[PDB]
């Protein structure tokens, strides 16, 4: 059934991020942060619980199938195809 499993890890958000926000790793600290929508293949998960700069840990999805319209993509990710394969290689996919 391809269940959407959650996970937790240190977060380094710099602002509020609603649930369904794509995440990537900060190349410096390696904490989870919002995917910029421009670094190819950097997306690693989807935030499952709303969080902000005070959240020391984030709860995010590490698997499952998510609908293209439900994911809250960053504005900078203007290409539909690149968004649809943003998680290729992970256990997450987009429909």
């Amino acid at each position: 059934s391809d269940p959407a499993h959650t996970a937790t890890a240190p977060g380094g958000l710099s602002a509020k991020a609603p649930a369904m926000t794509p995440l990537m790793l900060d190349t410096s600290s390696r904490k989870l942060v919002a995917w910029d929508g421009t670094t190819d293949g950097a997306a690693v998960g989807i935030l499952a619980v709303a969080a902000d700069q005070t959240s020391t840990t984030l709860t995010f999805y590490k698997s499952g199938t998510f609908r293209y319209e439900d994911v809250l993509w960053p504005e900078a990710a203007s290409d539909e195809t690149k968004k649809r394969t943003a998680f290729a290689g992970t256990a997450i996919s987009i429909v």
Copy 2:
């Protein structure tokens, strides 16, 4: 023993590709294309339904365990070990 889940995403194949063909992302468009068999760690999935250059969306496995002899590796992938770990880090593995 682990479920072989499928996923779908934009396709950009250059030619006909049968099911069980290892896929990677086109470095430019980021559409799914056949794994070249030489770019280390580029494989992201295994084509689940035969397709070709006219297929705009492909269906592929994003998880599961597959027999080394069942996967249709590209001729350029000439090293058995490199093929067997081509999916290390994804939900797919080879047996």
Copy 3:
């Protein structure tokens, strides 16, 4: 609660490695070896059954959630955060 699936792949350990040891791919042979704890994002799995340099094949975890305290991290991995996100992007996560 997510299942911890195992997998097998060629091994290139240079010494004895107990279960729960993080694994990465050797850049040259691409066999599974112990993660060095310094190459960012190189961890691809966690050894599931003890092995050593004579082990031609390793059985490892390719998914699941594991306790930070249960994983036998290499000494070089001295930053807690980097260890906690060492598997981000794979089906494995740390709690």
